[model samples]
Target: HWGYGKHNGPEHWHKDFPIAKGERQSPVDIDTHTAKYDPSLKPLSVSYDQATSLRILNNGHAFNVEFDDSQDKAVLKGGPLDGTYRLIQFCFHWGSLDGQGSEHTVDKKKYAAELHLVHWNTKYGDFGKAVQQPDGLAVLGIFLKVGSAKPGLQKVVDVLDSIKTKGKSADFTNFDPRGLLPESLDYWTYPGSLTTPPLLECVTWIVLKEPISVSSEQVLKFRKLNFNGEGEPEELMVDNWRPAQPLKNRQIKASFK
Candidate 1:
């Protein structure tokens, strides 16, 4: 019953999920001035087989485009990682309006939207088992700015209407998540937990410095999805983001210029 609302929101998550109070929790502010440049960091290696994308579904929390990663067809290697991390699925978190909704902010500035591509280190085993280890998971986050129309984004939003309700899914294929990324791989890396519950501190977050564009008309459709299932009180799937956590003594490492 937890959601991005007054009764059961980010502030109250620690009550039921103890990890919410952990210091290594995610969605932290990226203070560029405080980050250190690491020249030794390797350039990101991305090998995505776009056809591996199975389908898109709304899992009550957010709409995710799931992929078939049983094989190494689509994987991310190098760049602050020990081994190849398979791309499992991708999801989006946004706000009800402008100037808000992104989980992680840069220099205290919030973008119009945030896209998270969830991945798991294959060194352990399957995603479920790997999630338990400290170095088992990795997430690639890309921020979206409001600008002219982006054709790459249209493929994702086009299927949102089909899976507007919780538990709904639609056939999705030939859509490469990497196509949504900017030209540059320059990014900031940090160790954090999942933005959602069970908050495992296993993620090696690689956030790109550049942001892609999406028209205002396209961004508004994301809020039209429902959190609750049919016959229940309609709760708009807006602001599905956790507030930034306290940075105890962590440092952000930059991989490029």
Candidate 2:
């Protein structure tokens, strides 16, 4: 039987795939006391050219935007490190319940939603292969919370009306993921893995401590999505966040330093 509700959620997901209990799982609560973190090692600048093509895909779970690096002028340079990385794909995770939802937690605090900006090392032939290498990926984690108003996020919410139903999607041409990035690139960095299957450990995670605000009504729309499609009974998409995992001797560094 399919489990529903907090008690039977992710904890039950592991029964079908025992490997899901691996130590490298994401959304791990970052403990600052665990290690000495140095923010100087993080990337400071990212460049994207006109060739960048952003395609929105109906991933069944959520609306995911895949960035075609081959078509765009995307590069990473400056800051703590200097290297060229290619934009890959970005996705969101939310909860069915309104008050609490988030992928990554810091000090036990949760938010309304979370967005992931995925990138891959240019050295790798493709994103698929990059998943297996140590320095193959970088993920920028942004939090979303209920607040007064945000003009910048209007573009994302406006498109939701068209794809309001589960499994519905439309190609969003001329869109840039950079538009969604928080103004403060200052973030907390750590070494972690993907939250999804294949759980690759090549991710260098940069999580923003500050969250972008959206309306409670906007969040409710996200909960309307189902795992399959609109034909099925709508499953509340809220609470899709993964629970915090053990830090495993990992050190989380902040950009403030």
Best candidate, TM-score-wise? 1
TM-score of every model versus the real structure = 0.97, 0.84
lDDT of candidate model 1 versus the reference:
0.86
Tell me the deviation in Å of residue 139 in model 1.
Answer: 0.6
Clash pairs, candidate 1, are none
Off by over 4 Å in 2: 1-9, 12-19, 32-43, 49-53, 77-82, 165-167
Can you write out model 2's per-residue Cα lDDT over 67-141, one digit (the tens) per residue? 667733665544433355677777888776645677787677777788987878777878888888767887878
lDDT of each: 0.86, 0.68
In candidate 2, residue 209 scores what lDDT?
66
lDDT of residue 138 for candidate 1: 81
